[PDB]
Symmetry: C2
């Protein structure tokens, strides 16, 4: 299902209707494929509609896994996973991110 | 279980441990009996910890039912109820709430 083109004027009732139709298959495995400025919004709506108990298994398919406001679904028991090209543990990457900060 | 005296410095992990022991009881019916300052905080933690899907059922035993930030457990399907002495439908009350506002 497309989620990019939903207009901002009604971006509450749309995402409700969307997941309430995802209830047809009673779906619990999901992937979100969008840049983090969409991710933050749709994740906030997910937590607000309450569908982040354990069993939902959202995969974030972007290189900005920790860049999202991830640490709120963290505690819902819904498993979460993704992909990251940044590694804060590596040498000059680490020292740069220190410096950057 | 007391919820009034939990210190503000650590008022996140305590509320996890609290409800996680109710999860050891597998509890699904709950009552809160506290003023809004406690209500809003613990309700926020409830939604953040992911225990407000349908099946949970909360009674807010204070006279400030709509005064709380109730409108963000609204969509979780967890039933909610409370007790209200205020009635916006009343004759002079409505006109005062207009005036007040």
């Amino acid at each position: 299902i497309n989620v990019g083109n939903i207009n901002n004027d009604k971006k509450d009732e749309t995402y409700r209707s969307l997941f309430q139709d995802l209830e047809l298959k009673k779906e619990r495995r999901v992937i979100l494929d969008c840049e983090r400025d969409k991710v933050n919004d749709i994740v906030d709506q997910v937590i607000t509609i309450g569908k982040h108990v354990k069993g939902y298994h959202y995969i974030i398919a972007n290189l900005g896994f920790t860049d999202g406001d991830l640490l709120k679904i963290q505690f819902g028991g819904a498993e979460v996973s993704g992909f990251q090209i940044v590694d804060y543990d590596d040498s000059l990457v680490s020292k740069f991110i220190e410096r950057w900060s």
